[PDB]
Design a protein around this ligand. Structure first.
Ligand SMILES: C[C@H](CCC(=O)Nc1cc(C(=O)O)cc(C(=O)O)c1)[C@H]1CC[C@H]2[C@@H]3CC[C@@H]4C[C@H](O)CC[C@]4(C)[C@H]3CC[C@]12C
Lengths: 10, 223
């Protein structure tokens, strides 16, 4: 879930 | 009877995060301006859904307690609730935001995008049944929070920590029904019915999925 986790950690 | 100071605080944090949702006029213009066909229509609608998932992640991170859950449960909650949260949010927009003529083009695109009337009919029936309830913004925001913090999605580790975040939202929502629409003592039960009605869209969506393309964020969140 590379993109999802990126949006989670912003 | 009124919300306690701690329920007012909770409701305030939810409302402040709900109000900062906006979809870019860049997308909204595409509804108005791009060519019309089954493939183009599905492409545009896929872009709007991709944006609502981003708005949804931003909303969800600011929900009180969400960022104390374990990361894997955070992902599990977002994947399980995406479809339902999109439809709740879009429902609010059809019934309150969008004028008659631009809802009309949006709907024309939806009905001309290669999606079954099996999907489309319950969708528009949901919109109109939700619009009947004349929900406040507070009700839309709490209901959306309650959809997201649903402790019985597949694949969650610590279900109790999610229960502990959802139940106070449920309590706030029932209190809100008695204060915002006390002329209908059964308002809370009607909101509940929309919770279950929203769940049917997981079924139709999974059938739309099997027939078929998408953006990477949608591919992750739906596999
Ligand atoms: C059109 C509508 C979004 C409308 C909306 O939210 N508008 C808006 C407009 C404005 C504005 O004009 O100011 C501001 C705001 C603001 O939030 O501020 C918001 C989307 C939401 C969910 C979408 C489906 C998801 C499943 C599926 C995914 C597939 O990929 C494609 C086919 C399917 C059935 C999709 C079809 C189209 C749907 C219904």
């Amino acid at each position: 879930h590379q993109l999802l986790r990126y949006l989670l950690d912003k | 009877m009124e919300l306690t100071p701690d329920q007012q605080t909770l409701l305030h944090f939810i409302m402040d995060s709900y109000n900062k949702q906006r979809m870019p006029q860049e997308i909204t213009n595409k509804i108005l301006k791009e060519a019309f066909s089954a493939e183009e229509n599905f492409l545009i609608l896929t872009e709007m859904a991709t944006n609502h998932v981003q708005v949804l992640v931003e909303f969800t991170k600011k929900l009180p307690g969400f960022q104390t859950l374990d990361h894997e449960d955070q992902i599990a909650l977002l994947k399980g609730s995406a479809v339902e949260a999109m439809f709740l949010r879009s429902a609010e927009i059809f019934n309150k935001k969008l004028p008659s003529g631009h809802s009309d083009l949006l709907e024309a695109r939806i009905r001309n995008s290669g999606i079954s009337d099996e999907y489309i009919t319950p969708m528009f029936s949901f919109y109109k049944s939700i619009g009947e309830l004349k929900m406040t913004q507070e009700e839309y925001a709490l209901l959306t929070a309650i959809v997201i913090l649903s402790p019985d999605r597949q694949y969650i580790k610590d279900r109790e920590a999610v229960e502990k975040l959802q139940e106070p939202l449920l309590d706030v929502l029932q209190k809100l029904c008695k204060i915002h629409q006390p002329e209908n003592p059964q308002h809370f039960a009607c909101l509940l019915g929309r919770l279950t009605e929203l769940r049917t869209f997981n079924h139709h969506h999974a059938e739309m999925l099997m027939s078929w393309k998408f953006t990477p964020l949608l591919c992750e969140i739906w596999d």
